[PDB]
Amino acid sequence: PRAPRTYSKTYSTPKRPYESSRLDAELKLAGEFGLKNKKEIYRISFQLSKIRRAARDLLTRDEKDPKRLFEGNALIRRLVRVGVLSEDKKKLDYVLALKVEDFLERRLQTQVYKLGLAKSVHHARVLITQRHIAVGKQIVNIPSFMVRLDSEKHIDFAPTSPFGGARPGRVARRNAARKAE
């Protein structure tokens, strides 16, 4: 038979789902960033845990260790590129200091809100899922899209979007036709 295709889980249930403080923090995060369910928060927590565990393991090694240098440089480069880690904080120690909110900040929904295209984070999500937002020359319909530093400046309304210079949507031309009749 054909060789296997690998698959993996991108989230894991927390050690204690029932902590009141954890519930309150999840509520705050979901409301602030307009997240649909707890699965998104669990996913981002899983990723951040993976990066921080890797940072711990690399820190454990002796300094100048070639594996330490190479892997730490790669991880810091990736974190700086994705925008979570600032330019001046290129040390594994500051990688270990990251928080979930930083990753939630880079989400395309939050960025679309911040740049002024939407009046609410929920409005940003609706715009994204309705094919109105384009990164560069490309339409993206995924709120969880993680925006890079280079790509943040190219977020705009899509050319095909009615808000981006295309023809009016079905409702607009329908009403215009009815008024004309």
Binding site: P1, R2, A3, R5, P66, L69, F70
Partner: protein, 258 residues
């Protein structure tokens, strides 16, 4: 099993062929030929997955049946003909000649050569023995039987074979200070100079090899192939000249050239 196998699963195929694991279920099984199965590159993989001339096996068969591909100066038509180390692949229509040489990463590399350098090959003398009627002969690593060798030629030496006549033009003795090429093991593809041969009667001989960067490594004698004297290779070497580069230095060079 009740007889010889005729199928080769993709996962079980040699790694250095670099085959997609999801394209299909089976991989080309090299037919019997001059080179061993695990140390050979079938023509289908060479024409399709390396040169990208053919898009699929049927086009490769179409190419071969046209008699455009020559291996070692002879036309081959088998899609799974096991081309291997030091074999010359000539495509006259493209006016291209290739010599199959491992790169530093350990994979067969597309190395373009001039016609003059394509006129000959190098072979490691695997055996020297008297045949019937008292005629000495030499068997090389590619299974070529050459009669009436120069008497000084001994096992593990290198012979420069002219493809047109299949005769020895010159030979290199295996001695300290000679330039050698690694053809097996984790050091596959590296180039260096012999430093010393450890002999172990009834066991595998070991050879110490010093690279141009002064790094040293030990390899079993079966995996060593003498290719010339230091600084004077008898064949053109691929890019990198068989020098192993650390991951960090590779990163630096890649970033610089980009």
């Amino acid at each position: 099993a009740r007889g010889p196998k005729k199928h080769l699963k993709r996962l079980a195929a040699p790694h250095h062929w670099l085959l997609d694991k999801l394209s299909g279920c089976y991989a080309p099984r090299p037919s019997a030929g001059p080179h061993k199965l695990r140390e050979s590159l079938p023509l289908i993989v060479f024409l399709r997955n390396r040169l990208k001339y053919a898009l699929n096996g049927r086009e490769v068969k179409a190419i071969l049946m046209q008699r455009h591909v020559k291996v070692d100066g002879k036309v081959r038509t088998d899609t799974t003909y096991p081309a291997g180390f030091m074999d010359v692949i000539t495509l006259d229509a493209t006016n291209e000649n290739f010599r199959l040489v491992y790169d530093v990463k350990g994979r067969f590399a597309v190395h373009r050569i001039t016609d003059e350098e394509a006129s000959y090959k190098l072979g490691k003398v695997k055996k020297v023995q008297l045949g019937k009627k008292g005629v000495p002969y030499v068997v090389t690593h590619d299974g070529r039987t050459i009669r009436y060798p120069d008497p000084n030629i001994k096992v593990n030496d290198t012979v420069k074979i002219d493809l047109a006549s299949g005769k020895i033009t010159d030979f290199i003795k295996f001695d300290a200070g000679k330039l050698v090429y690694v053809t097996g093991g984790r050091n596959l593809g590296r180039i260096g100079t012999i430093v010393h041969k450890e002999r172990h009667d009834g066991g595998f001989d070991l050879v110490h090899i010093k690279d141009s960067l002064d790094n040293t490594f030990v390899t079993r004698l079966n995996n060593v192939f003498v290719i010339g004297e230091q600084g004077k290779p008898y064949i053109s070497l691929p890019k990198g000249k068989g020098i192993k580069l650390s991951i960090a230095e590779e990163r630096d060079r890649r970033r610089a050239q980009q």
